[PDB]
Design a protein around this motif. Sequence first.
Motif, PDB file in Angstrom:
ATOM      1  N   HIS A   1      18.532   0.660   7.232  1.00  0.00           N
ATOM      2  CA  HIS A   1      18.434  -0.749   7.588  1.00  0.00           C
ATOM      3  C   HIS A   1      19.536  -1.596   6.967  1.00  0.00           C
ATOM      4  O   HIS A   1      19.719  -2.743   7.385  1.00  0.00           O
ATOM      5  CB  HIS A   1      17.070  -1.304   7.189  1.00  0.00           C
ATOM      6  N   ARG A   2      20.277  -1.071   5.989  1.00  0.00           N
ATOM      7  CA  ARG A   2      21.300  -1.864   5.317  1.00  0.00           C
ATOM      8  C   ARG A   2      22.629  -1.158   5.092  1.00  0.00           C
ATOM      9  O   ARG A   2      23.583  -1.823   4.675  1.00  0.00           O
ATOM     10  CB  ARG A   2      20.781  -2.373   3.962  1.00  0.00           C
ATOM     11  N   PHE A   3      22.739   0.147   5.347  1.00  0.00           N
ATOM     12  CA  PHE A   3      24.002   0.851   5.146  1.00  0.00           C
ATOM     13  C   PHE A   3      24.440   1.713   6.317  1.00  0.00           C
ATOM     14  O   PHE A   3      25.606   2.123   6.344  1.00  0.00           O
ATOM     15  CB  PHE A   3      23.936   1.733   3.893  1.00  0.00           C
TER      16      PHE A   3
ATOM     17  N   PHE B   1      16.487  -2.569  -5.633  1.00  0.00           N
ATOM     18  CA  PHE B   1      16.020  -2.398  -7.004  1.00  0.00           C
ATOM     19  C   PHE B   1      14.541  -2.034  -7.052  1.00  0.00           C
ATOM     20  O   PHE B   1      14.143  -1.138  -7.803  1.00  0.00           O
ATOM     21  CB  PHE B   1      16.299  -3.679  -7.791  1.00  0.00           C
ATOM     22  N   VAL B   2      13.712  -2.709  -6.252  1.00  0.00           N
ATOM     23  CA  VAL B   2      12.274  -2.438  -6.272  1.00  0.00           C
ATOM     24  C   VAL B   2      11.987  -1.023  -5.783  1.00  0.00           C
ATOM     25  O   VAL B   2      11.205  -0.279  -6.394  1.00  0.00           O
ATOM     26  CB  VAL B   2      11.520  -3.487  -5.436  1.00  0.00           C
ATOM     27  N   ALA B   3      12.617  -0.628  -4.673  1.00  0.00           N
ATOM     28  CA  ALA B   3      12.387   0.711  -4.142  1.00  0.00           C
ATOM     29  C   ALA B   3      12.837   1.783  -5.127  1.00  0.00           C
ATOM     30  O   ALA B   3      12.134   2.780  -5.330  1.00  0.00           O
ATOM     31  CB  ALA B   3      13.100   0.880  -2.803  1.00  0.00           C
TER      32      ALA B   3
ATOM     33  N   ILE C   1      10.341   2.016  -8.098  1.00  0.00           N
ATOM     34  CA  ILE C   1       9.029   2.598  -7.826  1.00  0.00           C
ATOM     35  C   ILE C   1       9.156   4.060  -7.402  1.00  0.00           C
ATOM     36  O   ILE C   1       8.702   4.970  -8.114  1.00  0.00           O
ATOM     37  CB  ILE C   1       8.276   1.786  -6.756  1.00  0.00           C
ATOM     38  N   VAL C   2       9.799   4.294  -6.256  1.00  0.00           N
ATOM     39  CA  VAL C   2       9.670   5.581  -5.581  1.00  0.00           C
ATOM     40  C   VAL C   2      10.383   6.679  -6.359  1.00  0.00           C
ATOM     41  O   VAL C   2       9.842   7.774  -6.553  1.00  0.00           O
ATOM     42  CB  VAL C   2      10.194   5.476  -4.139  1.00  0.00           C
ATOM     43  N   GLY C   3      11.615   6.417  -6.799  1.00  0.00           N
ATOM     44  CA  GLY C   3      12.353   7.434  -7.530  1.00  0.00           C
ATOM     45  C   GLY C   3      11.705   7.778  -8.855  1.00  0.00           C
ATOM     46  O   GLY C   3      11.629   8.951  -9.241  1.00  0.00           O
TER      47      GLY C   3
ATOM     48  N   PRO D   1       7.249 -11.226  -4.040  1.00  0.00           N
ATOM     49  CA  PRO D   1       8.332 -12.184  -3.734  1.00  0.00           C
ATOM     50  C   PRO D   1       8.866 -12.112  -2.307  1.00  0.00           C
ATOM     51  O   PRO D   1       9.524 -13.067  -1.876  1.00  0.00           O
ATOM     52  CB  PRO D   1       9.438 -11.824  -4.733  1.00  0.00           C
ATOM     53  N   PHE D   2       8.631 -11.018  -1.576  1.00  0.00           N
ATOM     54  CA  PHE D   2       9.283 -10.835  -0.279  1.00  0.00           C
ATOM     55  C   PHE D   2       8.991 -11.959   0.709  1.00  0.00           C
ATOM     56  O   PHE D   2       9.944 -12.458   1.335  1.00  0.00           O
ATOM     57  CB  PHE D   2       8.897  -9.476   0.320  1.00  0.00           C
ATOM     58  N   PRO D   3       7.740 -12.385   0.930  1.00  0.00           N
ATOM     59  CA  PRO D   3       7.518 -13.506   1.861  1.00  0.00           C
ATOM     60  C   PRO D   3       8.211 -14.791   1.450  1.00  0.00           C
ATOM     61  O   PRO D   3       8.653 -15.549   2.322  1.00  0.00           O
ATOM     62  CB  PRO D   3       5.992 -13.662   1.860  1.00  0.00           C
TER      63      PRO D   3
ATOM     64  N   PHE E   1       0.804  -1.210   0.000  1.00  0.00           N
ATOM     65  CA  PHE E   1       0.000   0.000   0.000  1.00  0.00           C
ATOM     66  C   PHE E   1       0.842   1.269   0.000  1.00  0.00           C
ATOM     67  O   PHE E   1       0.359   2.307  -0.464  1.00  0.00           O
ATOM     68  CB  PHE E   1      -0.987  -0.036   1.163  1.00  0.00           C
ATOM     69  N   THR E   2       2.102   1.207   0.438  1.00  0.00           N
ATOM     70  CA  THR E   2       3.011   2.316   0.162  1.00  0.00           C
ATOM     71  C   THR E   2       3.176   2.512  -1.343  1.00  0.00           C
ATOM     72  O   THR E   2       3.087   3.640  -1.859  1.00  0.00           O
ATOM     73  CB  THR E   2       4.366   2.059   0.823  1.00  0.00           C
ATOM     74  N   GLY E   3       3.399   1.412  -2.068  1.00  0.00           N
ATOM     75  CA  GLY E   3       3.493   1.507  -3.519  1.00  0.00           C
ATOM     76  C   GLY E   3       2.215   2.025  -4.157  1.00  0.00           C
ATOM     77  O   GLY E   3       2.253   2.815  -5.108  1.00  0.00           O
TER      78      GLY E   3
ATOM     79  N   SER F   1      14.694   5.096   6.215  1.00  0.00           N
ATOM     80  CA  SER F   1      14.612   3.765   6.812  1.00  0.00           C
ATOM     81  C   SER F   1      15.185   2.700   5.885  1.00  0.00           C
ATOM     82  O   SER F   1      15.952   1.832   6.325  1.00  0.00           O
ATOM     83  CB  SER F   1      13.163   3.441   7.163  1.00  0.00           C
ATOM     84  N   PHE F   2      14.833   2.753   4.596  1.00  0.00           N
ATOM     85  CA  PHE F   2      15.300   1.739   3.658  1.00  0.00           C
ATOM     86  C   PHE F   2      16.813   1.749   3.498  1.00  0.00           C
ATOM     87  O   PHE F   2      17.394   0.706   3.184  1.00  0.00           O
ATOM     88  CB  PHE F   2      14.641   1.928   2.289  1.00  0.00           C
ATOM     89  N   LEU F   3      17.462   2.895   3.700  1.00  0.00           N
ATOM     90  CA  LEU F   3      18.912   2.968   3.595  1.00  0.00           C
ATOM     91  C   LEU F   3      19.615   2.732   4.924  1.00  0.00           C
ATOM     92  O   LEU F   3      20.734   2.210   4.937  1.00  0.00           O
ATOM     93  CB  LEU F   3      19.333   4.326   3.029  1.00  0.00           C
TER      94      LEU F   3
ATOM     95  N   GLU G   1       9.135  -5.119   9.596  1.00  0.00           N
ATOM     96  CA  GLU G   1       9.627  -4.677   8.298  1.00  0.00           C
ATOM     97  C   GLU G   1      10.268  -5.844   7.561  1.00  0.00           C
ATOM     98  O   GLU G   1      10.281  -6.968   8.069  1.00  0.00           O
ATOM     99  CB  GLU G   1      10.623  -3.531   8.458  1.00  0.00           C
ATOM    100  N   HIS G   2      10.814  -5.562   6.375  1.00  0.00           N
ATOM    101  CA  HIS G   2      11.476  -6.619   5.563  1.00  0.00           C
ATOM    102  C   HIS G   2      12.911  -6.826   6.053  1.00  0.00           C
ATOM    103  O   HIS G   2      13.280  -7.990   6.309  1.00  0.00           O
ATOM    104  CB  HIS G   2      11.433  -6.249   4.074  1.00  0.00           C
ATOM    105  N   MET G   3      13.686  -5.744   6.179  1.00  0.00           N
ATOM    106  CA  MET G   3      15.081  -5.875   6.573  1.00  0.00           C
ATOM    107  C   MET G   3      15.246  -6.035   8.078  1.00  0.00           C
ATOM    108  O   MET G   3      16.183  -6.707   8.524  1.00  0.00           O
ATOM    109  CB  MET G   3      15.886  -4.680   6.069  1.00  0.00           C
TER     110      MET G   3
HETATM  111  C1  LIG Z   1       7.599   1.315  -2.707  1.00  0.00           C
HETATM  112  C2  LIG Z   1       8.136   0.568  -1.496  1.00  0.00           C
HETATM  113  C3  LIG Z   1       8.308  -0.918  -1.764  1.00  0.00           C
HETATM  114  C4  LIG Z   1       8.850  -1.686  -0.569  1.00  0.00           C
HETATM  115  C5  LIG Z   1      10.244  -1.243  -0.150  1.00  0.00           C
HETATM  116  C6  LIG Z   1      11.056  -2.372   0.469  1.00  0.00           C
HETATM  117  C7  LIG Z   1      12.077  -1.879   1.475  1.00  0.00           C
HETATM  118  C8  LIG Z   1      13.041  -2.941   2.025  1.00  0.00           C
HETATM  119  O1  LIG Z   1      13.205  -3.979   1.358  1.00  0.00           O
HETATM  120  O2  LIG Z   1      13.595  -2.671   3.114  1.00  0.00           O
END
Ligand SMILES: CCCCCCCC(=O)O
Lengths: 328, 157, 122, 303, 52
Positions: free
Chosen positions: D257-259, D196-198, D201-203, D153-155, D102-104, D253-255, D175-177
């Motif tokens: 969680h991994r960097f 890649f997915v983020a 989509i977002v950019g 694919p995430f689950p 739903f963010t997407g 958050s997305f950056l 969250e995912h990460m």
């Molecule tokens: C448009 C957002 C799509 C989900 C982002 C996934 C973030 C992550 O893998 O930490």
Amino acid sequence: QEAEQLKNQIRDARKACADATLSQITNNIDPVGRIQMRTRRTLRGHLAKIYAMHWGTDSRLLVSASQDGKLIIWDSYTTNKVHAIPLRSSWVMTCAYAPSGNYVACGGLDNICSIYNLKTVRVSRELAGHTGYLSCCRFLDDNQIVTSSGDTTCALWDIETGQQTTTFTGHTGDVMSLSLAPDTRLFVSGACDASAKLWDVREGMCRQTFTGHESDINAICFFPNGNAFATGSDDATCRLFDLRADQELMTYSHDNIICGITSVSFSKSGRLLLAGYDDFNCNVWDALKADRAGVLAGHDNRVSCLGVTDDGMAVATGSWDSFLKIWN
Amino acid sequence: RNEEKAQREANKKIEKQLQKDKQVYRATHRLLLLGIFETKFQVDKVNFHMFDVGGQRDERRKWIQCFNDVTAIIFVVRLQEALNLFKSIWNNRWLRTISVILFLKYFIRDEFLRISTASGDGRHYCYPHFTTENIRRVFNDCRDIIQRMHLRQYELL
Amino acid sequence: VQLQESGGQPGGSLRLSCAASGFTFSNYKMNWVRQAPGKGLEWVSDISQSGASISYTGSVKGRFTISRDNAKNTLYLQMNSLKPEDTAVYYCARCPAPFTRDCFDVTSTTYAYRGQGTQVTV
Amino acid sequence: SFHPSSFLLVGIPGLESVHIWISIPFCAMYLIALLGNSTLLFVIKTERSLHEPMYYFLAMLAATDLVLSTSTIPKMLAIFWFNLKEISFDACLTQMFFIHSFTGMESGVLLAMAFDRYVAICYPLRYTTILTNKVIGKIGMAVVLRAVLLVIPFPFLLKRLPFCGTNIIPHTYCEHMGVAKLACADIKVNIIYGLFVALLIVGLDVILIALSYVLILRAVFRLPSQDARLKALSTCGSHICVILAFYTPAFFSFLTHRFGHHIPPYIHILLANLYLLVPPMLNPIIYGVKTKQIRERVLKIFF
Amino acid sequence: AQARKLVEQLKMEANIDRIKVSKAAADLMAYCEAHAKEDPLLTPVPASENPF
Ligand SMILES: CCCCCCCC(=O)O
């Protein structure tokens, strides 16, 4: 000189024949009460503003006309549609229902009256001969019709021959509406010269003229017994007249009403008079005693057309937001 | 039972036909030549409609309310009579928010714009022209009018 | 609705009066129009419901003055330094609808809310 | 592959002694968001003069905000109030999936609104023949399908990692990460695919939105009139402020969680919960109340 | 031509043998009273028998 003397004589006779008012005699009758009415049906199929509507003889079907160029036949019991007729000209401002129920008529800014046949929908006749736009048309029979135009004339036609049988003339302004008596022997008319006239269909000459308003007259209708009529005008008033007395009896107005009146109709017994206004809603008046008894307020634009069934079971109002509402 | 099925099937076709005419009705723009006949034309894949009223009397206070939803009024230009009619139309209740395309030197234009800019509260403007160029001019003014309407809608003006 | 108009050497002065009956005089916008011989009807002067806003044609701006009296439901036109180019029949017209700022058909022929007129020759 | 029964959410790490003081504003803002969107949807549906494509897009945005805000705040409130931290393994996966999808969807809705505004202002005479009902339906279908197909694919990616050891995840929601960092294996595939997915989509949405706003304001400033030069700025500024308040913490958050591991965790958790709460509360005020034809129709019903 | 027609019309309308108003109001009052028992908009009909 002569005209002034005749007018003065008529005025003196009118003053002489009057001794009592309608209010003094009806000062003891019980008031009607608070008339509360609500919307029972909503018909929504038009695209532009609605201009006219007419009920049917069986009190179940009706026809509606809109400025987008359509005629729609409804079924108010089930809200289902029956017929949709496109028109040649997009500027239509009147429609009518034949008493038998197998004819419709329409007209407008094209100075022509078109009659369509429903039990075949294809056009049946196209009567021409007026010099200005048509304002109203009423069926008398499957072969007779009466119209009023913007060239200050009224007409009685013969559909079989397509010719103008009779022409009624004498008004000095645009004729806005007409109303046919139950006896079908005479009718009444109102125009923009702030006067109303009574016409005899058989002979074809004006019998009586009534002058009480101060501006253009928009709507007219007959009383149930055919011995009186009411009319609304552009000065924000309604007035009731008489035929055997030949003068006005009652006026309906309020100090907070500024807009003009667009439509007028009567109830079954004549106790209620319905008036559509330019300020988006319509009022109910007690005919015997001028006193407001109800408000129908559901439309977002000005009310343009108003009708009551022959059985007196429901009322139908059209408007400029392209909706028809049935109230009961 | 069967009668109701027939009635519903009859109404469905009416609804399907009616939904087709709405797209045609909203895609065309209407005009009014005030010096009934109808002329339809097309410019740059845009449908345009024009009506001319000359079969009526010179008493316009009753049949002019039929044209309250038109996009613009084409006024063809005695000068004082034109100015008085322009003032009468400008202050009407039903034709209040209606733009006028003038088709007439700077003195007359300034006199018209004096009454044009007197009131309106920024709801309608005036587009004077001094006369296949006329059609292009009308097209441009119509585009400007519709753009300003959209701007007012989206809270950008 | 009845409107009766009465009254009427270059450079002189003149005054016309008009009395109205049959309607509420206070809530109507009134005006003076003229018809010259050889031409059509023309608009001359205007006056509002209370006399706050006054309008003249450019030909007679400054020379003539229009007024109104609501207590006696009558209105007046006063002309000074009249020229021979002002000989015509003067009518008093009334706007068709009350509580409005628009007045459409006052100069139309076969208007219903207009008087009989008085002739002025200079 | 040894998945645990359930997990434990701790909430704000290092601020466990003031878990109730922090929760005072959260309840009020969630309450306001729970009322504004419902009122806006009711008004849009019940009226028949509000049936235009702009209002349809606004309705989709309101529904998206209402769904986004309702999958996170109640569990956070439960943690803060009654110390209910236990969560099952599958409720974590479903919660994460819904949040990301739903963010997407919200991003896609914003992109569609920007496209509608651009076509309306820059192509006035062709607006009615370009955007019809079929196009709106296709746009909505495309938005939903793209989000669902990209996030699904995430689950499956998280179900193949062996989980040996602890189950505590220092966050407020799944969250995912945040879940993936407790695995006992290498998570390079998750890194690359999520990044890649983020980015896809977002950019891609943000660039197009900025281009549309620049084009619209450039077209506004070319008009001979100058009364539109200030109102356009006064509205676009609020729009851009809300858009940034939604978009920036998501990247943060997305950056992180991994960097980024040197950043203290409590501020990371606090900023991760802002883009999920603030736009749902501030959207109807700037879009519904401030607009001309909705405020006056709301005050028309209650009075 | 117009003045002569107007004078003739006024002469024709000056003799119609009108009657009093108090007698012409009681007729409408009695008409309303006699038909007031069958007007649905005055006396609400039972909901079962109401078509709408
Ligand atoms: C448009 C957002 C799509 C989900 C982002 C996934 C973030 C992550 O893998 O930490």
